[model samples]
Target: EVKIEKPTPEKLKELSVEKWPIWEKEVSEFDWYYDTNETCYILEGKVEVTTEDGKKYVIEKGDLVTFPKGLRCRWKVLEPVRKHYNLF
Candidate 1:
């Protein structure tokens, strides 16, 4: 079995879902995949989003973006990220 140790309650509690809340995460530049209907409100910082078509979009704080299921892309964070995201 693969063992992946998670954070202690102290650290995890802050990251835990609070009523399916649009969550905020601080991460370095990376590519990730989320399979679900998703939306978010950027409360702070900026993010660079690229679609499979090679189109690039810069989403800033206060801009809300939504994507349907089967969406694939890369996240290039131009600034330290701080935003809220709702997932299906």
Candidate 2:
């Protein structure tokens, strides 16, 4: 499942999330594959992601989400999205 949570300000600072580059997407839907683990902090908008096995996760503004490596999923953007992400 896609991990979604709210991080404390100190944790966000410790992760230096603000320094990560931004990614923006307009309202859309698409298939996605993760080659490496990704941790993102949402700055705006909302989205729903469904894994190959049919588990769905809702991600939205102020959410911190982690996508595991080797995961395949579909993304449905309910609103335009802007986020800060780091891949590892």
**What is each predicted model's overall lDDT from 0 to 1?**
0.61, 0.95
Candidate 2: global Cα-lDDT?
A: 0.95
Assess the local accuracy of residue 64 in candidate 1 as a C-alpha lDDT between 0 and 100. 54
TM-score winner? 2
Residue 39 shift from truth in candidate 2, angstroms:
0.3
Lowest lDDT block of 10, candidate 1: 1-10
Error of 2 at 16 (Å): 0.6
Candidate 1 residue-wise lDDT, 1-88, digit = tens: 1111333556435644333455555645666565887766566777777776676777776665666677677888877766566676
Q: lDDT per residue, candidate 2, 13-34, as tens digits? A: 8999989999999999999999
Assess candidate 1 and give its lDDT: 0.61
TM-score of every candidate relative to the true structure: 0.67, 0.98
